[PDB]
Paper text:
The EF-hand domain-containing protein 1 (EFhd1), a homologous protein of EFhd2, is localized in the mitochondria. Here, we report the crystal structure of the core domain of mouse EFhd1 (CDEFhd1, residues 79–180) in a Ca2+-bound state, comprising a proline-rich (PR) region, two EF-hand motifs, a ligand mimic helix (LM-helix), and a C-terminal linker.
We initially attempted to crystallize the EFhd1 ΔNTD (residues 69–240) construct, but only the core domain was crystallized due to proteolytic degradation. The CDEFhd1 structure comprised two EF-hand motifs (residues 91–162), an LM-helix (residues 169–176), a C-terminus of the PR region (residues 79–89) at the N-terminus, and a C-terminal linker (residues 177–180). Within the structure, Ca2+ ions were coordinated in each of the two EF-hand motifs of CDEFhd1. Although the sequence conservation was limited to the EF-hand motifs in AIF-1, the overall structures of these proteins for Ca2+-bound states were relatively well-superimposed (RMSD of CDEFhd1 and CDEFhd2 = 0.403 Å for 85 Cα atoms, RMSD of CDEFhd1 and AIF-1 = 2.089 Å for 63 Cα atoms). Collectively, the overall structure of CDEFhd1 was similar to that of CDEFhd2 and AIF-1, but the hydrophobic interaction network between the LM-helix and hydrophobic groove of EF-hands in CDEFhd1 was similar to that of CDEFhd2, but not AIF-1. We identified two Zn2+-mediated interactions between one CDEFhd1 (MolA) and other symmetry-mate molecules (MolB and MolC). Zn1 was coordinated by H129 (MolB), K133 (MolB), H157 (MolA), and E163 (MolA), and Zn2 was coordinated by D142 (MolA), D144 (MolA), a water molecule, and E166 (MolC).
Author numbering: 79 to 180
The structure:
């Protein structure tokens, strides 16, 4: 997976910021942000979500259907937010906008 090819619209500094946020909230360091790590992230960001809200956020970008976010899926959140592709009620929008990222 090349995030430089896949997401050229992202500066290389923005990309390492995103890697940093990703590594922060992947507590277990398995390379994924799972449902509980996402829940904690939305709380620590100040935009807590319902349990089923968190599952629907993951499903929006869970391209391999395993219920957890790999780093390429986590990048896709900000790609979709940046391109205006998120539904207006999506928790991913709140993740992006509460995140300290633009
Ligand atoms: Ca994890
Ligand atoms: Ca996944
Ligand atoms: Zn996977
Ligand atoms: Zn897109």
């Amino acid at each position: 997976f090349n995030p430089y090819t896949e997401f050229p619209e992202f500066s290389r500094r923005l990309l390492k910021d995103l890697e940093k946020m990703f590594k922060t909230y992947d507590a277990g360091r398995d390379g994924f942000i799972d449902l509980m790590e996402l829940k904690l992230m939305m709380e620590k960001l100040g935009a807590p979500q319902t349990h089923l809200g968190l599952k629907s956020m993951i499903k929006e970008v869970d391209e391999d259907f395993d219920g957890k976010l790999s780093f390429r899926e986590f990048l896709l959140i900000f790609h979709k937010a940046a391109a205006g592709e998120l539904q207006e009620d999506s928790g991913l929008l709140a993740l992006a906008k509460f995140s300290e990222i633009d």
